[PDB]
């Protein structure tokens, strides 16, 4: 007993930060095996920052004018290349510590860690869900440009996030290894807001499920409803409609508890139109939504 | 600001990871941390099932000898050379010195003090996570399985402090443990025998330290025009399960008094109004729960 949130142990990201320096502008980098992984706005100065055109300011920077430091080893570049928003830098030097590693892009509502770095220096590490409306919550202390999202498959890191920018909300947006933005932003200084969130309703599910697989069924009914009279009640609480896909990956779940899917969102339904009612689940009075149906496979079955 | 939309953060695990081994003793396997040349563990490795209701630890280990223990590093065996009981914590002299120890420092904490888990099985982590020790010397640990011997910790400048290590699980699916010299937090013992954690509450100066993080960043939604005493505040709180807040916790919310303009016994006043009428839709610093794992240390060092 006891369902607790985890990151995954960071020690293998870890040994793959550094910091970049372009001239004024210091941010994180990820270096992996000989390249050097950051966001390509490390180039940017206050004059570029509206409107910026990257890969005409990029192939007019010198190698030198990057300045890489792992520790207190300065790296030399000896190339340079954009993939979208992602900078690539070629260093002289392979990281003895690269794990074994793939880049990966996630879906909304899918969760990670993020290792939160300062000046090339891992500060922290959290564990997180990209929201519907592809931001991450967390705040200018829970890292800064650069800092990168992960998954540990075996020995295996699954690098999928990179942090760009802090936006006015207390969140942050950002694209996966290969420069591809989650969402719908920029990387430019122009005015750019998130759009309304919502509650991620697989994960919720998948934390019921969590919940009665912890001896927690208080809130289990008799009632089974059709997925589109869920999803019309859902949507008026602000939840996002669940899918077959959704109902899917709750299969184990539900084979693993004897509760079938649409028995489980009959349980949630109630929970949205009544609430509580002065009771907790898992020992929280609300519904958590950034665990997915496999951190419950994997935590607790 | 700064803080808004602030999550919670352990520290990175690297430096612990690299010190986590497995140590088996006949049948029982469990978590070791080794740091040089010592392999520290639960002393409960040496018991069975059947010797955890009434284990006699002296006899227990009287009868091992440094070659029934197996430490295990990765696919590396590690030679046991001697071994010694402190309290309730097994200390396993090895040949081999270990090359990623890093600075460190054994530290007792305090109810209400926060760190960070690295959850193992096996001697392999698995995850980690920050909480705070509870006033009822417990914490709120992982599903579980067998992660005894997983410690807890907190980094400063790549000095590990270690504090904690996981020891038993109670009824209740919460966890107690040693400090690093095998002392026991809270009035636990390393036996199988009827133990329960006492009524948990709120660690009141964590949240008042939350509230002024939240000032600090603009968000005010909270804050009442009243001030309370001391003993006012103490008996309506105690109502809500939450701490007494003592001078210590009045004096250590010193700076962040100073730096907003509000008395401590005035945010207190704000954080009795908040007990009475309750957080039902709005948020704090993009939460919404009252914060009680992040410590005045913490803020005030965010706050600068």
């Given at each position: 007993?006891?369902?607790?949130?985890?990151?995954?142990?960071?020690?293998?990201?870890?040994?793959?930060?550094?910091?970049?320096?372009?001239?004024?502008?210091?941010?994180?980098?990820?270096?992996?095996?000989?390249?050097?992984?950051?966001?390509?706005?490390?180039?940017?100065?206050?004059?570029?920052?509206?409107?910026?055109?990257?890969?005409?300011?990029?192939?007019?920077?010198?190698n030198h004018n990057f300045l890489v430091?792992?520790?207190?080893?300065?790296?030399?570049?000896?190339?340079?290349?954009?993939?979208?928003?992602?900078?690539?830098?070629?260093?002289?030097?392979?990281?003895?510590?690269?794990?074994?590693?793939?880049?990966?892009?996630?879906?909304?509502?899918?969760?990670?860690?993020?290792?939160?770095?300062?000046?090339?220096?891992?500060?922290?590490?959290?564990?997180?869900?990209?929201?519907?409306?592809?931001?991450?919550?967390?705040?200018?202390?829970?890292?800064?440009?650069?800092?990168?999202?992960?998954?540990?498959?075996?020995?295996?890191?699954?690098?999928?996030?990179?942090?760009?920018?802090?936006?006015?909300?207390?969140?942050?947006?950002?694209?996966?290894?290969?420069?591809?933005?989650?969402?719908?932003?920029?990387?430019?200084?122009?005015?750019?807001?998130?759009?309304?969130?919502?509650?991620?309703?697989?994960?919720?599910?998948?934390?019921?499920?969590?919940?009665?697989?912890?001896?927690?069924?208080?809130?289990?009914?008799?009632?089974?409803?059709?997925?589109?009279?869920?999803?019309?009640?859902?949507?008026?609480?602000?939840?996002?409609?669940?899918?077959?896909?959704?109902?899917?990956?709750?299969?184990?779940?539900?084979?693993?508890?004897?509760?079938?899917?649409?028995?489980?969102?009959?349980?949630?339904?109630?929970?949205?139109?009544?609430?509580?009612?002065?009771?907790?689940?898992?020992?929280?009075?609300?519904?958590?939504?950034?665990?997915?149906?496999?951190?419950?496979?994997?935590?607790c079955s």
């Amino acid at each position: 007993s006891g369902f607790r949130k985890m990151a995954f142990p960071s020690g293998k990201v870890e040994g793959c930060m550094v910091q970049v320096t372009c001239g004024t502008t210091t941010l994180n980098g990820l270096w992996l095996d000989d390249v050097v992984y950051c966001p390509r706005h490390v180039i940017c100065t206050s004059e570029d920052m509206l409107n910026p055109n990257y890969e005409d300011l990029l192939i007019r920077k010198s190698n030198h004018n990057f300045l890489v430091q792992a520790g207190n080893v300065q790296l030399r570049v000896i190339g340079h290349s954009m993939q979208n928003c992602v900078l690539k830098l070629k260093v002289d030097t392979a990281n003895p510590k690269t794990p074994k590693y793939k880049f990966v892009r996630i879906q909304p509502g899918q969760t990670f860690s993020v290792l939160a770095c300062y000046n090339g220096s891992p500060s922290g590490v959290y564990q997180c869900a990209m929201r519907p409306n592809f931001t991450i919550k967390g705040s200018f202390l829970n890292g800064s440009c650069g800092s990168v999202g992960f998954n540990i498959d075996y020995d295996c890191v699954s690098f999928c996030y990179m942090h760009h920018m802090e936006l006015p909300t207390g969140v942050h947006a950002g694209t996966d290894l290969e420069g591809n933005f989650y969402g719908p932003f920029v990387d430019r200084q122009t005015a750019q807001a998130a759009g309304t969130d919502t509650t991620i309703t697989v994960n919720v599910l998948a934390w019921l499920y969590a919940a009665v697989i912890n001896g927690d069924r208080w809130f289990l009914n008799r009632f089974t409803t059709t997925l589109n009279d869920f999803n019309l009640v859902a949507m008026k609480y602000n939840y996002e409609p669940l899918t077959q896909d959704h109902v899917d990956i709750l299969g184990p779940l539900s084979a693993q508890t004897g509760i079938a899917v649409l028995d489980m969102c009959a349980s949630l339904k109630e929970l949205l139109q009544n609430g509580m009612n002065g009771r907790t689940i898992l020992g929280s009075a609300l519904l958590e939504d950034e665990f997915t149906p496999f951190d419950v496979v994997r935590q607790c079955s």
